[PDB]
């Protein structure tokens, strides 16, 4: 009765949005960047190798000073590194060894971790005693935590495999806002430079844009053909990039509300684990599970270089805030810094 | 180097020493993954052998066992099943008293789960210990309700031994490439204390095979 009427009404609006975004596609990005000089060839080399983890690395995150970094492994340890000297600052043991994510606070006073225990744990680094101790255990989710990112010293955002993201207040311990619009597990997060809106990607092959204050969904993007495992903003804040299990990466735009470019090759048949951008926005770095990393010209859809030197799957990568180095982690229990 | 740089280097060396000792301690333990259905009977196994996932620890004849139970995670398991890639054994619990019951028949659901786990890409050479629980209720119920309800093409005698053998064969036949892994089967009940010995005997073979590989001759 009314159910089928509502189904027909819902089907009548997807056609409208599709026709609306088909009428604002006069040109293409490849058609506009056909008269600029290509970046020739990127020859990068390993400058440091960080050793010490005894199992496979799952996550890493750079600090805002571009010298310190944090790493997490299935061995049950969280390690803080000084990359200029290659020596350890802190080693933190975890109650649960099934960790899947970690983050670093912009101020530099706290770190965070989580995994299959369905809890996000926050660690204080600066105490009158010389040790590191737990400050809060945030516990409200029903699935495993896949990503987390600080906003300041008192706000954090989490995404879980129970089809939900959340915004927390660390002092009280409660979640002020819950974001629920997806259909499968949410695998990745990304914060905008102004910390006023964020994007998420899930296992329903969709990406969504959110408003932190009001708490609602603004835009939905659908191009891929399998699960989405990585997401990242353009330095401007007006575009973003996604990686999936269908051996492609894609570039999406916010103001035009559609897709701009696909990155793929016929010799690549495996999935993508991570994505990141360069400081200018001209290079796009992607990590694959055929043991190496690829560098793409983001304006021309061309391959400009390969990063090889890992013996197993590449799990995570990151670029510094000053743009001086790139770091890669892997399932072989090693971290590498390239420049 | 300045004085403070030397002090920092000493701090790093001590951290490295502690990490090495912890790794050496952790590398000498037996890790088990526990799987089954909701009503299969795992709580009885846990009692006899002693949100998120649950961990159990016990000790038997100078060996340390950590058992991991993941029954509360109701989500896509293709995303976290590779965390358990390096693990000594998988315990699989099946109740052979629910062939008559319906949630789709329960026994067929158990077969689908067993088939999915056994032929995965992360568990090519991992041993499986299979427990078949609640044989008393099965022996009582095999006389009234026939087994043809579950298996239409049975065509055999209706007693305890024939039915038990048929069900075991049906479960063991789902192992494609039965030349790179072993499957152990045991018939248990509610009041029975011999299962820890069964697990110990199964794990000794894995230990022998692993420390032949450390010495070179695989």
């Amino acid at each position, epitope marked *: 009765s009314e159910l089928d009427q509502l189904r027909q009404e819902a089907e009548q609006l997807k056609n409208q949005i599709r026709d609306a975004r088909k009428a604002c596609a006069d040109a293409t990005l490849s058609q506009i960047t056909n008269n600029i000089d290509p970046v020739g060839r990127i020859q990068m080399r390993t400058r440091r190798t960080l050793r010490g983890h005894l199992a496979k690395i799952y996550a890493m995150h750079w600090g805002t000073d571009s010298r310190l970094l944090v790493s997490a492994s299935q061995d049950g340890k969280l390690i803080i590194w000084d990359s200029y000297t290659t020596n350890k600052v802190h080693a933190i043991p975890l109650r649960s060894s099934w960790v899947m994510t970690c983050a670093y606070a912009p101020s530099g006073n706290y770190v965070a971790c989580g995994g299959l225990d369905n809890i996000c744990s926050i660690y204080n680094l600066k105490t009158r*005693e010389g040790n590191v101790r737990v400050s809060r255990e945030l516990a409200g989710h029903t699935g495993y935590l896949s990503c987390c990112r600080f906003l300041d010293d008192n706000q954090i955002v989490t995404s879980s495999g129970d089809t939900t993201c959340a915004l927390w207040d660390i002092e009280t311990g409660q979640q002020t806002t819950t974001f629920t619009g997806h259909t499968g597990d949410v695998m990745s997060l990304s914060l905008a430079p102004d910390t006023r809106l964020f994007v998420s990607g899930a296992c329903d092959a969709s990406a969504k844009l959110w408003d932190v204050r009001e708490g609602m969904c603004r835009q939905t993007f659908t191009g891929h053909e399998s699960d989405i495992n990585a997401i990242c903003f353009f330095p401007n804040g007006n575009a973003f990039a996604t990686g999936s299990d269908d051996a492609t990466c894609r570039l999406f735009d916010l103001r035009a509300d559609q897709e701009l470019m696909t990155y793929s090759h016929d010799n690549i048949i495996c999935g993508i684990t991570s994505v990141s951008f360069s400081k200018s926005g001209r290079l796009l770095l992607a990590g694959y599970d055929d043991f190496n990393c690829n560098v793409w010209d983001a304006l021309k859809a061309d391959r400009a270089g390969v990063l090889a030197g890992h013996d197993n799957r590449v799990s995570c990568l990151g670029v510094t805030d000053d743009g001086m180095a790139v770091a890669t982690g892997s399932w072989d229990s090693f971290l590498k810094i390239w420049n | 180097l300045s004085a403070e*740089d030397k002090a920092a280097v000493e701090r790093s060396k001590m951290i490295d020493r502690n990490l090495r000792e912890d790794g050496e301690k952790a590398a000498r333990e037996v890790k088990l993954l526990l799987l089954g259905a909701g009503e299969s009977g795992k709580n009885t196994i846990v009692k006899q052998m002693k949100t998120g996932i649950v961990e159990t620890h016990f000790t038997f004849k100078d060996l340390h066992f950590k058992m991991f139970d993941v029954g509360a995670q109701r989500s896509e398991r293709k995303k976290w099943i590779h965390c358990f890639e390096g693990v000594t054994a998988i315990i699989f619990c099946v109740a052979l008293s629910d062939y008559d019951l319906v949630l789709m028949n329960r026994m067929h659901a158990s077969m689908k789960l067993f088939d999915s786990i056994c032929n995965n890409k992360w568990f090519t050479d991992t041993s499986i210990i299979l427990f078949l629980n609640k044989k008393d209720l099965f022996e009582e119920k095999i006389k009234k309700s026939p087994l043809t309800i579950c298996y239409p093409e049975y065509a055999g005698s209706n007693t305890y031994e024939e039915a038990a053998a048929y069900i075991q064969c049906q479960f063991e036949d789902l192992n494609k490439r039965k030349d790179t892994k072993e499957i152990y089967t045991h018939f248990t009940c509610s009041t029975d204390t011999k299962n820890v010995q069964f697990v110990f005997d199964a794990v000794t073979d894995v230990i022998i095979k692993n420390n032949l590989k450390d010495c070179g001759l695989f």
Partner: single-chain antibody, 232 residues
Framework: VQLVESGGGLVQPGGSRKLSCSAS????????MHWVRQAPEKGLEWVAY????????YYADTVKGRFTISRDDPKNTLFLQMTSLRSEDTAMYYC??????????????WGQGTTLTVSSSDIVMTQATSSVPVTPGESVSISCRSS???????????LYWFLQRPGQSPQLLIY???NLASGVPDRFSGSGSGTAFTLTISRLEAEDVGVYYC?????????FGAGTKLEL
């Protein structure tokens, strides 16, 4: 967080004595320890250093061969043993904690001290002033000079400022040149270059009166400088 030391008293020349210090409220095993003494009316002077894990030990040249330093982590105690006591060892002794990693703040908590009475190639740090008359509400500057550049090739400058109030143990103000310590008001600032350094107080209340000391940490044996007094 507290450190209480004991021993002390009056001994005849030629004797030997042991001094102890007990810590409570922090992680003692991850810290290094220093012994620092002060003469009855003179300035500060560094004595001995022991490291975390008991791997590195350092002595001054006035006590090498006569003194010994040791620690007991399980009972949280630090020991200093003295043999062949002259009359120049009459002083007050303080225990100091310090930790070393990237970004740490060494020398940030001192004990209370014990008194010992006996009956009867080094950097020089200079403070040419003494006893500046000051009035509340004004602004004050103090100067210091080294005989060797304290700027290492890694971009660090190792200069420390300390404050001692009447009847109290010294307190850290600025650890590495231009770095402010925890719990210290933003009135204080520090600057300098190469071999010449200065400290500045913007508008001063009546509690920041005492003696101000400077120290270098470029290399051992960790020299001090005779302080400057602020009088009201």
């Amino acid at each position: 967080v507290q450190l209480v030391e004991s021993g002390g008293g009056l001994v005849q020349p030629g004797g030997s004595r042991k001094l102890s210090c007990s810590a409570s409220g922090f992680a003692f095993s991850s810290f290094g320890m220093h012994w620092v003494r002060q003469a009855p009316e003179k300035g500060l002077e560094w004595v001995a250093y022991i490291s975390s894990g008991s791997g590195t030990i350092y002595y001054a040249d006035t006590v090498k061969g006569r003194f010994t330093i040791s620690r007991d982590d399980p009972k949280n105690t630090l020991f200093l043993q003295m043999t062949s006591l002259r009359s120049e060892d009459t002083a007050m002794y303080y225990c100091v904690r310090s930790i070393y990693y990237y970004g740490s703040s060494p020398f940030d908590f001192w004990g209370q001290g014990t008194t010992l009475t006996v009956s009867s190639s080094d950097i020089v740090m200079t403070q040419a002033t003494s006893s500046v008359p000051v009035t509340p509400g004004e602004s004050v500057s103090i100067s210091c000079r080294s005989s060797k550049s304290l700027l290492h090739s890694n971009g660090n400058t190792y200069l420390y400022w300390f404050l001692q109030r009447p009847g109290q143990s010294p307190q850290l103000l600025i650890y590495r040149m231009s770095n402010l310590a925890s719990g210290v008001p933003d009135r204080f600032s520090g600057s300098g270059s190469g071999t010449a350094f200065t400290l500045t107080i913007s508008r001063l209340e009546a509690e920041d009166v005492g003696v101000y000391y400077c120290m270098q940490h470029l290399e051992y044996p960790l020299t001090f400088g005779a302080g400057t007094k602020l009088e009201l």
